[PDB]
């Protein structure tokens, strides 16, 4: 439990806080997809007792990344839903964090809360990103346009290039949102949520698509504008 991955979720000060779930197995599952997502995408907007957990766990992942050991590689590989993000974790973080020993992840409490419930929102980041390869100049103040587009880049940083093996993966993942069966999934989702009924979900005949070709031919345009 002193081992810098394996988690102890209590309320006593020696233990990192347990966030509410169904089972400690469920806590582990949740934690795993949170860490996976944070490694994939440096920030997580995360409510509750979950965020400090993410902070500590991210620090653990960076510690493992600094280990740079085959046992470390393997133990991080046990932990994540993504194998690929493990490779990302051992390519990026050492150069990123070579000058820091302590507190690698920044937690920022947001003044907005879920409408759904009173639970507060925390903004969890990795620290210095000007040393990162693929996250170099990115802007997180607002989201991207359609969520499969690469996120905003700061105006002064436009001309940045990213590791090819990452935008290959990202484009392969984003390329299934342009096929029309995703559009059918989208409309059918409207139908479903409307049936379970959830307010402010428009009728599936009003739901005009996320992806069109005109928007693609302008998006790719500005994407090579960033390149």
């Amino acid at each position: 439990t002193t081992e810098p991955l394996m988690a102890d979720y209590g309320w006593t000060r020696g233990k990192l806080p347990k966030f509410r779930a169904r089972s400690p197995f469920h806590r582990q599952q949740i934690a795993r997809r949170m860490v996976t997502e944070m490694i994939r995408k440096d920030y997580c907007i995360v409510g509750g007792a979950r965020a400090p957990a993410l902070r500590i766990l991210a620090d653990h992942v960076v510690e493992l990344a600094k280990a740079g050991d085959t046992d470390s590689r393997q133990q991080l590989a046990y932990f994540l839903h993504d194998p690929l993000m493990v490779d990302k974790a051992f390519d990026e973080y050492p150069r990123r964090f070579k000058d820091m020993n302590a507190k690698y992840a920044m937690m920022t409490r947001l003044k907005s809360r879920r409408r759904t419930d009173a639970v507060a929102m925390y903004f969890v980041e990795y620290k210095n990103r000007d040393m990162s390869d693929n996250h170099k100049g990115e802007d997180y103040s607002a989201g991207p346009e359609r969520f499969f587009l690469p996120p905003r880049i700061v105006e002064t940083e436009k001309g940045i290039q990213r590791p090819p093996h990452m935008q290959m993966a990202f484009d392969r993942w984003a390329s299934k949102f342009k096929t029309e069966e995703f559009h059918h999934w989208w409309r059918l989702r409207h139908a479903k949520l409307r049936y379970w009924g959830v307010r402010n979900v428009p009728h599936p005949s009003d739901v005009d698509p996320l992806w069109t070709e005109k928007e693609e031919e302008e998006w790719h345009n500005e994407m090579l504008a960033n390149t």
Binding site: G137, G159, I160, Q161
Partner: peptide, 17 residues
Amino acid sequence: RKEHDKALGLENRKPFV
């Protein structure tokens, strides 16, 4: 200039932003 002209006389690292 002289160094690119040495490179060119014989005829990546930081990307231009």
